[PDB]
Design a protein around this ligand. Structure first.
Ligand SMILES: CN(C(=O)[C@H]1CCNC1)c1ccccc1
Length: 460
């Protein structure tokens, strides 16, 4: 029975509005409703993995698990295995997988972050799950960010706190946050970003939604504008939005947006908004295709409509050779020529590099590079031809070309990372000097760039 090179992953996000769900929610897991929907011909085909994120979830874990398992069983006639479930207050993530995947899935991690301080600590934050599917690392983050049209900055701060403090994936990757730990990272939830238009335009917005004319609304979506200005979700992808705003509805219909200020809203307007979102970030040159992104039309217990996204995702096998794991394959090497980091730091310390990859027995520290002044003020750290020769555990090109090298540039003085990035080994050629490049981030903010050449030797 051969190991897969592709799986399909269902991601759901629903703010349940502290109300029990209706008796039928199968439309959600089938990606039926508005937006980019799944073909009817696929309805009996199970996704490999279903990741369900809820907010304002009033159910016990047992109650929600029973509804989810019974739903998927009705759709697929498959009894899904529970990989993980984690709840912080009323924020929940559930991971369900086909039984055939039970022995492919390992290294299951769960965590949560509470966002804000005092007043603003008590109900917002994130839950997450990571695991290995054979040779591929998968992370999943369900976040409920700060609400309110005038708090996009708070939402961006909540995002940075979640990506700094959420403890998932391989702890040996100590310089790296969740935005570098996974082959594929999916980040979803009630992100709570609003359509930033004057309150007096509410009926005009509703009119535009009724005509399915979203272009002038999306141009004012705060998540898209903040992302454009590199304020949040730097280096993340999102499928084009082709479904109506998923908030705020009158309950028990989808015919009405409830936007007017009420005591129950803290006298705040809730203009129709795409609060409920799915984004992802995958390592360079790994296969990931969004196959659906939409909202349900027939689940009306909440003031939010459920959102679905489905993905084809590239996975690799758990590779064993005569040599690695447990030794090097001397027929493999990774060389770095003409390499330099460009940092935005105003500081003057010496810097060195750390190379982390599952293709190495352990991480590799470089010698300090040579600091030069860039023509526009920048710090340029030159490594030239001084970077070490990396010794992969396996030289088979069917393995090695599928791997990635995480790079941290660290201060000699503090041993603190100033920048993290990632290089694909999916090269156009072996035994050939080829350009490499990655942006460098720290706490998910742009801190610089790393560029140079690579020379990859495989057994072929
Ligand atoms: C131009 N653009 C991109 O290329 C995405 C996809 C790759 N990472 C960012 C973008 C950025 C922010 C908001 C909307 C679109």
């Amino acid at each position: 029975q051969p190991e897969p090179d592709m799986i399909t992953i269902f991601i759901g996000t629903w703010n349940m509005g502290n109300a029990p769900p209706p008796k039928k929610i199968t439309s959600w897991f089938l990606s039926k409703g508005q937006g980019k929907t799944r073909d009817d011909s696929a309805d009996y085909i199970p996704h490999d993995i279903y990741v369900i994120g809820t907010q304002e979830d009033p159910l016990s874990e047992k109650e929600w698990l029973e509804i989810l398992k019974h739903s998927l069983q009705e759709i697929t006639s498959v009894t899904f295995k529970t990989v993980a479930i984690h709840t912080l207050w009323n924020i929940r993530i559930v991971v369900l997988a086909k039984p055939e995947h039970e022995n492919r899935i390992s290294h299951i991690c769960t965590d949560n972050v509470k966002t804000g301080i005092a007043n603003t600590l008590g109900n917002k934050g994130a839950v997450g799950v990571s695991f290995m599917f054979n040779g591929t690392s998968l992370g999943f983050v369900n976040s409920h960010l700060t609400s309110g049209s005038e708090k996009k900055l708070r939402r961006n701060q909540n995002y940075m706190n979640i990506l700094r403090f959420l403890a998932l994936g391989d702890k040996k990757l100590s310089p790296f946050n969740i935005t570098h730990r996974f082959t594929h990272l999916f980040w979803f939830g009630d992100l709570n970003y609003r359509v930033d238009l004057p309150t007096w335009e509410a009926e005009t917005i509703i009119q535009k939604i009724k005509q399915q004319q979203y272009a002038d609304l999306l141009s004012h979506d705060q998540l898209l504008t903040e992302r454009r200005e590199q304020k949040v979700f730097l280096h993340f992808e999102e499928e084009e939005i082709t479904f109506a705003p998923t908030y705020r509805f009158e309950r028990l219909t989808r015919d009405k947006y409830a936007y007017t200020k009420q005591k129950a809203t803290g006298m705040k307007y809730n203009l129709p908004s795409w609060c409920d979102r799915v984004l992802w970030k995958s390592y360079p040159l790994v296969h990931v295709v969004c196959q659906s992104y939409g909202s349900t039309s027939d689940i009306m217990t909440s003031d939010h409509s459920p959102v679905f996204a489905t993905f084809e995702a590239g996975v690799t096998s758990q590779f064993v050779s005569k040599n690695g794991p447990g030794t090097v394959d001397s027929q493999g090497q990774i060389e770095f020529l003409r390499c330099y980091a460009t940092l935005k730091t105003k500081s003057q310390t010496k810097f060195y590099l750390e190379f982390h990859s599952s293709c190495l027995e352990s991480f590799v520290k470089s010698q300090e590079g040579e600091n030069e002044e860039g023509s526009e003020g920048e710090l340029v750290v030159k490594f030239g031809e001084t970077l070490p020769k990396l010794k992969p555990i396996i030289s088979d090109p069917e393995y090695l070309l599928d791997q990635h090298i995480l790079i941290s540039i660290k201060s000699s003085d503090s041993d603190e990372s100033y920048g993290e990035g990632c290089i694909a080994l999916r090269l156009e050629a072996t035994e050939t000097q080829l350009p490499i490049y990655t942006p460098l981030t720290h706490h998910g903010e742009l801190t610089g760039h790393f560029q140079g050449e690579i020379k990859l030797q495989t057994s072929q």
